[PDB]
Design a protein around this nucleic acid. Structure first.
Lengths: 129, 210, 165, 167, 60
RNA sequence: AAAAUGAAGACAUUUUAACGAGUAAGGAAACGAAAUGGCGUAAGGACAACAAAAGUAGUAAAGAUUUAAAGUAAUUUAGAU
RNA sequence: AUAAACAUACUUUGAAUCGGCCAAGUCUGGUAAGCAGGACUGGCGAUGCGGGAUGAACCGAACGUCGAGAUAAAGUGCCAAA
RNA sequence: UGUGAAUUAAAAGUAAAAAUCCGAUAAUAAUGGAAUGAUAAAAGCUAUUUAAGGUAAGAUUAAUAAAUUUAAUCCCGAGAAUAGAAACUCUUGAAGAAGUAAAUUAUCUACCCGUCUUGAAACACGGACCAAGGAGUCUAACAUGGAUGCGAAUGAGAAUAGCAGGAAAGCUAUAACAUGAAGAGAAAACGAAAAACUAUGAGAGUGUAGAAAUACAUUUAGCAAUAGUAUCUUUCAA
């Protein structure tokens, strides 16, 4: 069972004039200029973030697989989402070593918890093995 | 337990027979008088209408301060909103003042029925709830001796004793769009325009708007 | 651009009524004013002593105090975005009894007369009369039948234009 | 659009105990439940007064409790505020329910034979309010209220915040 | 650099936002500057009624 | 906004109704039915494998370059080098 | 008569602002002015959208993100939907 | 001699067929769809019973009639009681479905940002490009306001004196004083109760009723606040 996750706008809200100057990054900033084309909602350039774009509360922050995210740093972190394995999914942190990742992956299979980094930091077993 | 529902059901039936008797009997008396006046060679002057239905035609931008206040006292606060208005010297003058912004006329019984049955709603606890049962009408207007939607219709159409209390509970109707005029809504209906008193022709406009 | 004098712009406001110059009535100084009465301030330019300010002309006020030669009057004045209470003392030469409640005082007497008979009717056991109906705006006229024997017909059509010269 | 008189803004009534005091929050829950279920105007009054700020919850002294309770012998004063002690005058015997009792005020009520209840004990004994006398303190006795307004006024002058060379 | 001198434009709209504040009832009940003898008569009766009331309160 | 429920769920509770443009300007923190909600930089005090070895780290930290995902957005998360 | 309980009455503290401009079944100076100055209202400023080819003010109508339907001003030989 | 607007006689005609025009209207319905959904039982619908009803118009006949006039007996019959039934198909997808991203093309759409200005895309000024730095901060006095402690008191981390621990941290110090408890007057000189009154107002009961909530009548209470008062202190003057 998994609901239909509907996104109202799948594009990116890019900062105005970010495509013309390299000093203006693409992270959004509301234009406060008194003569700004975008902030006056001219035809053609009237795309600003609003609360109306917010996705449905039921299907918010939900990964495409149908579950949520729950970062783990060791095996004991998995024990917090073993009652909710139909709701959460383990996501090993980026700094966790390869030796510790095997223990988490091995235990999470025991507890029937999905891991979203199941093929992360794997050894060189890709050629000649 | 719920043996009162049958008791409630029959009472609504009894009132409905009474309500329809009053409307039919009054309509019959007009025909008989007209028939007898023709036989005797007399002249019969039909009674002036008592009920008026007004619709807001123009938007909210660029309205004089005195016209703005009147449209708020008639609850015509939005374009394409219909309300019922008691006809007297006081209200007729007010409608003339706001003539460019409203169109009005005299509704038939079928117009009142369809408006209440389809677009009807009541203001209960500050909430605009659409009419879904007679129990919600009994709670709203129990002390005004209105217990069923038919009783609501009859009191509006005949303009009874408790019209003001009943009318003030009904929220202003929200109608769809329709072809307002022949030329445009910048002239009076007499000049082929859109606003002003349409007399009995408001029913045709309401038919496409309900 | 006018000057800020006390009695500016009073060529017509302070003029006496046509053929109404000279002394006033004797009723003006003989009328008895009691507290709570309604009066109208009407500046009499014939009497320049104690002349009320020209902004109060025609205003209706209420008597709030009776002094040996002057009658206290309380009117309402409009200020920037509020209303203030103005308390003046005016000799009877500049005020006038107001008829603002004349119609209301007629309904009060009609009801009181009816209520006086009801205590008689209830005392004797007879059913009691009802109070007079409330005022209503001119209502839609009912259905009327016009007899066909005392009726004449006048035909109405647009009139042929005729030169006025 | 729609032509309204005004747009909906937050209503300026508090509906919870201000601050993080755990006990005052518990009292609001206790009387929010009582007002909702019993549907009594008394519990609505206590719930409304518990949510006023400190400045709006003025103190009542034992002198005012003594006078207001003179003709109410078997009664319980209910004041949603601190109760201070008026050392100038004697304290009779009375049962008082209040948010706080001053050390000197509580000992004066207790010694005279009275009882200093809190607002949970009152809800246990008179939940809907049956032998209660609602009491609130004066608000206009604050020294701030003197200085409000224009001191140049002809009718009710203010009180002239003192400063440089205030003769 | 001449400027516009004065305008009443937008002054009635401003005045009706928080509209004309009517005075309260206590504004019409002031008695400062009333008749001197009427004030003397009223004070004489009030002192007579108050003294009688307090004498009765003293008896009980 | 109003009803209902309420020691802990969880999505800052459930239901119903109305509402949602905007320069200058205002809405500090906290306030269970919360008197606007949040993101980011650095430093200080605590918390971080509850059975006596208790957050991550030479089985690869921070940083950098990119590929994808979450969020209306501020930004966050993870893979590869 | 009609409307009005998120009504009504406010209290305290404080921000910004007082260069304004436009229209008209209005007026004064001027030969007149996209000139100068006023009375009442509505706007622009602070405002995008559909129409007038284009336009700060004109006409319709004022804006959370969208799907479908009747509409407004105004259009229906082609550009251009009819 | 022919046509003929109009009118007139007789036959037919109870004056509801069909078509067109003219008026009148638009909604009940039937059949096809479209957008967003739902899938299960019904205040569904159907069958059997008795019978409120059918106000031109459910039918027919009678008396007569410019009648939404009056009767008669037939039909149908709402409420209610008793029995009734919905569980499906086909296509495509790890030989890559649905979605998403990037690049290109096509239709529609898009004037340079910041700024002073009534008004700038402006033939108005600053701006070639990138990285890093970059501008409401601290000290002191006052006021309002939200949380806090204590309360006719509050503070006494005023200096300063001691304690353990070694400590710029922590704790303890019947304490000068600061603000306040009393106010007016330039000053000398003074220094507050009729143990108050009136009005409206917060709360609590009891009864009746609708009947679900809730509404009426009656007894009591008089807080906050606003206004007005009697009285009292000081001042030439409240």
């Amino acid at each position: 069972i998994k609901p239909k996750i509907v996104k109202k706008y799948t594009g990116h809200f890019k900062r105005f004039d970010s495509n013309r100057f390299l000093r203006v990054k693409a992270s959004w900033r509301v234009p406060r200029g008194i003569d700004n084309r975008l902030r006056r909602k001219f035809k053609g350039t009237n795309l600003l973030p609003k609360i109306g774009y917010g996705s449905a509360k039921a299907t918010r922050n939900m990964l495409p697989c149908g579950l949520y995210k729950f970062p783990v740093r060791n095996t004991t972190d998995l024990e917090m989402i073993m009652m909710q394995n139909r709701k959460y999914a383990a996501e090993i942190s980026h700094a966790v070593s390869a030796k510790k990742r095997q223990e988490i992956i091995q235990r999470a299979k025991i507890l029937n918890i999905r891991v979203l980094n199941a093929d992360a930091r794997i050894k060189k077993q890709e050629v000649a093995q | 337990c719920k043996a009162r529902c049958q008791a409630f059901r029959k009472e609504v039936i009894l009132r409905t027979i009474k309500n329809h008797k009053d409307i039919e009997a009054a309509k019959k008396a007009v025909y008989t008088a007209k028939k007898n006046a023709e036989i005797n060679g007399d002249l019969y002057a039909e009674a002036d209408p008592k009920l008026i239905v007004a619709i807001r035609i123009r938007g909210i931008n660029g309205v004089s301060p005195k016209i703005k206040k009147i449209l708020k006292l008639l609850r015509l606060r939005q374009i394409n909103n219909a309300v019922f208005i008691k006809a007297n010297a006081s209200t007729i003058k007010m409608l003339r003042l706001v003539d460019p912004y409203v169109t009005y006329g005299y509704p038939t019984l079928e117009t009142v029925q369809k408006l209440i049955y389809k677009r009807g709603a009541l203001k209960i606890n500050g909430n605009r709830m659409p009419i879904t049962s007679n129990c919600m009408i009994k709670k709203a207007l129990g002390d005004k001796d209105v217990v069923c939607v038919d009783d609501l219709v009859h009191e509006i159409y005949t303009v009874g004793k408790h019209f003001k209390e009943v009318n003030n509970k009904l929220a202003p109707f929200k109608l769809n769009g329709a072809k307002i005029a022949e030329k445009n809504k910048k002239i009076h209906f007499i000049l082929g325009g859109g606003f002003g008193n349409r007399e009995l022709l408001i029913n045709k406009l309401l038919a496409n708007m309900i | 651009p006018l000057s800020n004098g006390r009695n500016r712009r009073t060529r017509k406001l302070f003029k006496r009524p046509f053929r109404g110059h000279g002394l006033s009535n004797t009723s003006t100084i003989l009328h008895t004013y009691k507290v709570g009465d309604y009066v109208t301030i009407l500046c009499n330019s014939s009497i320049q002593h104690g002349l009320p300010y020209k902004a109060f002309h025609g205003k209706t006020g209420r008597v709030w105090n009776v002094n040996p030669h002057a009658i206290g009057v309380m009117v309402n004045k409009k200020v920037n975005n509020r209303i203030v209470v103005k308390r003046l003392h005016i000799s009877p030469e500049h005020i006038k009894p107001s008829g603002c409640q004349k119609d209301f005082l007629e309904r009060k007497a009609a009801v009181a007369a009816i209520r006086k008979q009801n205590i008689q009717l209830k005392k004797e056991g007879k059913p009691l009369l009802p109070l007079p109906a409330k005022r209503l705006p001119k209502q839609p006229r009912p259905a009327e039948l016009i007899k066909g024997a005392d009726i004449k017909f006048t035909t109405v059509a647009p009139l042929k234009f005729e030169e006025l010269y | 659009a729609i032509d309204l008189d005004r747009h909906h803004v937050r209503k300026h009534v508090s509906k919870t105990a201000r601050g993080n005091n755990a006990y005052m929050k518990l009292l609001v829950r206790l009387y929010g439940f009582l007002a909702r279920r019993t549907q009594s105007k008394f519990a609505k009054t206590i719930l409304h007064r518990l949510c006023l700020s400190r400045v709006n919850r003025p103190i009542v002294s034992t002198s005012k409790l003594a006078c207001l309770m003179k003709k109410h012998p078997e009664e319980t004063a209910v004041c949603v505020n601190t109760v201070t002690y008026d050392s100038r005058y004697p304290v009779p015997k009375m049962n008082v329910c209040a948010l706080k009792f001053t050390k000197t005020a509580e000992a004066a009520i207790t010694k005279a034979g009275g009882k200093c209840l809190r607002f949970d004990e009152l809800a246990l004994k008179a939940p809907t309010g049956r032998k209660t006398v609602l009491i609130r303190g004066k608000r206009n006795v604050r020294e701030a209220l003197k200085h409000f307004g224009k001191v140049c006024a002809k009718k009710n002058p203010a009180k002239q915040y003192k400063g440089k060379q205030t003769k | 650099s001449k400027d516009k001198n004065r305008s009443s434009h937008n002054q009635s709209h401003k005045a009706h936002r928080n509209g004309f504040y009517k005075p309260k009832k206590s504004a019409y009940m002031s008695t400062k500057g009333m008749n001197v003898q009427v004030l003397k008569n009223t004070k004489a009766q009030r002192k007579f009624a108050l003294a009688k009331k307090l004498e009765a309160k003293k008896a009980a």
